[PDB]
């Protein structure tokens, strides 16, 4: 009552309460940003220079994935199709069309097509497509339903815990060697029983080794 109004006793306690809420809200905003779909570029349809539609070439035309990414079951790298594979069809199909101008400008000149990488890794990760495909893991569980994407987007962010989830518990995501095709295939109702049997048959190593640092980082 000397130097303070009557309401200050309520305000001071309310201010402390408001301060705590603001602090909690701050940490919340921070975590939401580092896990958002804009920061990780998840569900964002990255625009390509030639506007290639996987939905037209897989679900309509009916091209196999290995016709284009021919190095997926043999090396760590899934091959990105050269202009020769595109000209094999577009030398007669839709020739003299504006949408294929960039593809026709290449192959005549040695310049490549500068596609944008959708699935990106920080170069200290070292992923291997061959070992995953040969051990009964399909593209549906990783890249999603790519066969129906007019523009390819990142289905989910490539966190470390996302790899650790399958490596520690592979019984939930393993499939019986129908990975290249059967994008329509989905986990059966009895996935745990089939998964444990597949892990034993394919010799998928226990989580003790698969969680080691040098399996990924080098």
């Amino acid at each position: 009552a000397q130097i303070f109004p009557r309401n200050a006793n309520l305000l001071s306690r309310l201010s402390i309460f408001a301060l705590v809420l603001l602090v909690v809200e701050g940490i919340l905003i921070l975590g939401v940003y580092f896990r958002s779909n804009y920061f990780r570029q998840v569900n964002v349809a990255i625009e390509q220079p030639v506007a290639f539609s996987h939905q037209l070439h897989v679900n309509v035309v009916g091209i196999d994935c290995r016709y284009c990414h021919t190095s997926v079951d043999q090396s760590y790298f899934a091959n990105i199709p050269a202009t020769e594979t595109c000209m094999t069809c577009h030398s007669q199909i839709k020739t003299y069309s504006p949408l294929l101008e960039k593809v026709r400008e290449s192959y005549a000149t040695g310049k490549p097509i500068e596609w944008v990488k959708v699935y990106d890794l920080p170069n200290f990760v070292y992923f291997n497509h061959s070992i995953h495909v040969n051990k009964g893991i399909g593209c549906s569980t990783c890249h999603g339903q790519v066969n129906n994407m007019p523009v390819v987007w990142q289905q989910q962010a490539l966190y470390m815990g996302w790899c650790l989830n399958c490596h520690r518990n592979p019984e939930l995501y393993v499939r019986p060697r129908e990975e290249v095709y059967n994008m329509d295939y989905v986990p059966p109702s009895n996935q745990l029983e089939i998964g444990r049997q597949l892990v034993a048959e394919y010799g998928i190593m226990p989580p003790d080794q698969l969680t080691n640092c040098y399996v990924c980082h080098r």
Binding site: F17, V24, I27, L28, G31, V32, R35, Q156
Partner: peptide, 27 residues
């Protein structure tokens, strides 16, 4: 007094659900 003890209690659990959601079932 007892009302504000309940208020600072609901505030706490509210925050926990909030926080737990973000750091667990969010991705």
């Amino acid at each position: 007094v007892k009302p504000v003890f309940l208020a600072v209690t609901l505030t706490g659990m509210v925050a926990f659900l909030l926080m737990v959601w973000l750091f667990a079932f969010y991705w």
